[PDB]
Write a protein that binds this ligand. Structure first.
Ligand code: 54F
Length: 126
């Protein structure tokens, strides 16, 4: 069902949270070889999550589930906010700009935390 597909998407999101916190520890310790690998891992994870979310939204639309569509349109928009911040973080890493990396890291955390009440609302709506 769309609901079990959302639970699968939610687990993929939690994997990115796990790899993100590990990466943050690695960055603070200056283990840039680890950070590079974790950033690659996170990129693939976000690509997957983004695809799952789009499929879920498209299915909610085909099902005429207006409330779930509204919530998923709001949540996907905020996902792109997180994604653009991630990508700028990756660029800051490539450039050796640790001040920007730190800024982007904290922002991506606040964007993610903010978008959690919505994420729980979608689970219930599908
Ligand atoms: N593409 C992308 C990459 C990193 C973080 C991010 O933020 C998120 C993740 C889930 C919900 C809201 N924002 C999105």
């Amino acid at each position: 069902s769309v609901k079990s597909e959302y639970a699968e998407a939610a687990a993929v999101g939690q994997e990115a949270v796990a790899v993100f916190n590990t990466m943050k520890a690695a960055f603070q310790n200056g283990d840039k070889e680890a950070v590079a690998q974790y950033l690659a891992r996170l990129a693939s994870l976000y690509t997957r999550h983004e695809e799952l979310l789009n499929r879920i939204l498209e299915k909610a639309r085909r099902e005429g589930n207006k409330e779930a569509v509204t919530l998923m349109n709001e949540f996907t928009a905020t996902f792109q906010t997180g994604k653009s911040i991630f990508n700028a973080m990756v660029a800051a890493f490539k450039n050796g700009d640790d001040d920007s990396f730190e800024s982007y890291l904290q922002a991506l955390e606040k964007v993610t935390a903010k978008g959690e009440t919505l994420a729980d609302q979608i689970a219930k709506a599908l």
